[PDB]
Paper text:
In Arabidopsis thaliana, three LOV domain containing proteins ZTL, FLAVIN-BINDING, KELCH REPEAT, F-BOX 1 (FKF1), and LOV KELCH PROTEIN 2 (LKP2) act in circadian timing and seasonal flowering. These proteins retain analogous elements, where an N-terminal LOV domain regulates activity of a C-terminal E3 ubiquitin ligase to target clock proteins for degradation in a time dependent manner. LOV domains are typified by blue-light induced formation of a C4a adduct between a conserved Cys residue and a bound flavin (FAD, FMN or riboflavin) cofactor.
Towards these aims we solved 2.5 Å, 2.6 Å, and 2.1 Å crystal structures of dark-state WT ZTL, G80R and V48I:G80R (residues 29–165) respectively. Namely, G80R structures are analogous to WT in all manners. The primary difference is the formation of a π-cation interaction that stabilizes the Dα/Eα linkage and C82 that is necessary for C4a adduct formation. Increased rigidity of C82 imposed by the π-cation interaction is consistent with having an effect only on photocycle kinetics. R80 within Dα forms a π-cation interaction with F84 directly above the photoreactive C82, resulting in steric stabilization of adduct formation. In ZTL, Q154 does not adopt a specific orientation as observed in all other LOV structures, rather it varies in all four molecules in the asymmetric unit of both WT-ZTL and G80R. G80R does not impact ZTL structure or allosteric regulation of Ncap or Ccap elements. In this manner, G80R acts as a photocycle variant only and allows direct testing of LOV photocycle kinetics on targeted degradation of PRR5 and TOC1 (see Equation 1). The G80R variant, likely due to the stabilizing effects of the R80-F84 π-cation interaction, enhances protein yields in E. coli substantially.
Residue numbers in the entry:
A (entry chain A): 13 to 133
B (entry chain B): 3 to 137
Write the structure that this text describes.
């Protein structure tokens, strides 16, 4: 009786798309809790757990770039990206980004939909 | 150690979420979140397996879309879905109790393997409206 995917909402107004909301699937799958992720950028998912301070090299920088262009140009994104759980275990993340236009025909929010796939060592 | 519960900030969820199955006929709902349940007044078990268009009816005992919801917007939505593209717009909906809801709806398709659409995601921002069908 559960969502098939993670949901993430960021604030497109504040600098660098802070997370204002994640759903329970996001929390259960990634091992992070809403409280520790709120206010941060989603790119911590590309670092191998919370004590890796650099993007992991197997994270496809071409896709990360496309994601950046898409957010900046206020358009849709779909792609796939290595991410990692809080415990460092890898995760394939089939990600969809979609902007929300507000009253001013301005982007207020971005929705991320995460269809997580499974593992390897 | 003692576990840490999931979902401590549901009450901070800014929008409804709906997921439909794009493969079954007529986009049946396979999931709705708790903001949807709370705002629309319809609870998950009653809406699963149906098409979202029931929200255009004034409550649960009206079979057809209310004449006040924009037939032009409804049409653009249909087009967008069937054309496998995204949609954003504003639609009159109704809570279970019959009261007007203004639904700022964004629809995005989820392509699977096969570069074929497996799901559509609906994000509902319920905004303010002056629409008021009197007492
Ligand atoms: C709503 C939203 C959800 C996102 N979800 C993810 C995610 O689940 N995994 C991920 O690796 N990046 C995700 N991102 C992307 C990063 O936050 C960031 O935009 C990306 O790493 C490119 O930016 P950068 O080059 O500054 O790192 C998301 C972005 C937004 C706006
Ligand atoms: C994922 C998804 C979510 C939807 N959410 C809503 C909604 O919240 N309110 C609404 O009035 N229609 C919603 N719809 C639209 C209707 O289900 C339907 O597509 C629309 O009325 C146009 O088609 P029709 O003229 O055949 O009814 C949603 C559609 C999809 C695919």
């Amino acid at each position: 009786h559960t969502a098939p995917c993670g949901f993430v909402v960021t604030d497109a107004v504040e600098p660098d798309q802070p997370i204002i909301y994640v759903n329970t699937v996001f929390e259960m799958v990634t091992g992070y809790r809403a409280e520790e992720v709120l206010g941060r950028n989603c790119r911590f998912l590309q670092c191998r757990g919370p004590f890796a301070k650099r993007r992991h090299p197997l994270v496809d920088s071409m896709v990360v770039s496309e994601i950046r262009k898409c957010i900046d140009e206020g358009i849709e994104f779909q792609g796939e990206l290595l991410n990692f759980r809080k415990d460092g275990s890898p995760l394939m993340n089939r990600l969809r980004l979609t902007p929300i236009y507000g009253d001013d025909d301005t982007i207020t929010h971005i929705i991320g939909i995460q269809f997580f796939i499974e593992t390897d060592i």
